[PDB]
Amino acid sequence: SAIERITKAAHLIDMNDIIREGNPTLRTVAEEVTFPLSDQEIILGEKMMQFLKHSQDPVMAEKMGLRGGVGLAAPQLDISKRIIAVLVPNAYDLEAIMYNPKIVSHSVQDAALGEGEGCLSVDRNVPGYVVRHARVTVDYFDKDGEKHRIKLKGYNSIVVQHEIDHINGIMFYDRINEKDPFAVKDGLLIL
Ligand SMILES: Cc1nc(NNC(=O)[C@H](CC2CCCC2)CN(O)CO)c(F)c(N2CCN3CCOC[C@@H]3C2)n1
Ligand code: NI
């Protein structure tokens, strides 16, 4: 399985482990993890965070052939589990490996990155504002099964929502306004 080979001590996630649109796993709803986690589930979270760190290192990214990433979801590795990693630099505005993340509150206000979004699973540009909640309250469990409840805004909020979308089989272009991709709707904050 993908999880068995990715969690080998010697394995370094690279772009060859990341599946692309057309793979049905990106459109399936990922399964919750149970606690306690297996060793493989903990190692996977660590491997995903290591990939983000490699992806943000100019030297390692070029040597490994990586697209830069600030987040990653296990379904992008063909692993249909509710596991995400987020690494948003300021050192880091947000560094977390989240098990069973869930939005439990959201603002009426929407937000979208002014520069649109990309996706490591999408090998093409799709222009437009990806409309998301401006602010979210997120529950998740860490590797030890301890529960965390955090409040996010700005870029941090966008990144986590993008990853949660992946574990629900949703892609970023699902949220662009097709009729006018750069419409600034009432109540939409452009970051
Ligand atoms: C905004 C941004 N999106 C990058 N790519 N897309 C991704 O991360 C996808 C996830 C993001 C897409 C929009 C919201 C979440 C991956 N995905 O598909 C996950 O599911 C970046 F790489 C990036 N940064 C800023 C920080 N920089 C530090 C130095 O190193 C380079 C790095 C570049 N910012
Ligand atoms: Ni993505």
Last residue before each break in the chain (C–N > 2.5 Å) = 90
Residue 10: partners with Cβ closer than 8 Å, 6 or more residues away: none
Is 163 part of the annotated catalytic residue set? yes
Alpha-carbon span 150 to 141, nearest angstrom: 11
Tokens at 97, concatenated = 């490996």
Residue nearest to atom 19 of ligand 1 (CA): 72
Residue positions counted in the chain: 191
Contact between residue 68 and residue 32 where contact means Cβ atoms under 8 Å apart: no
Alpha-carbon span 121 to 44, nearest angstrom: 18
Residue 143: partners with Cβ closer than 8 Å, 6 or more residues away: 37, 42, 45, 97, 99
Q: Among the atoms of ligand 1, which is closest to the Cα of residue 166? A: 20
Ordered domains of the chain (ranges, CATH): 1-191 (3.90.45.10)
Tokens at 164, concatenated = 């949660």
CA angle 173, 178, 182 (to 5 degrees): 90
Based on the number of CB atoms within 10 Å of its own CB, is 121 exposed (0-12), middle (13-18) or buried (19 or more)?
Answer: buried
| Cβ of 121 below 6 Å from ligand 1 | yes
CB atoms < 10 A from the CB of 81, how many? 20
User: Which of 70, 83, 115, 166 should be mutated for ligand 1, with most atoms under 8 A from CB?
Assistant: 70
Contact between residue 83 and residue 98 where contact means Cβ atoms under 8 Å apart: yes
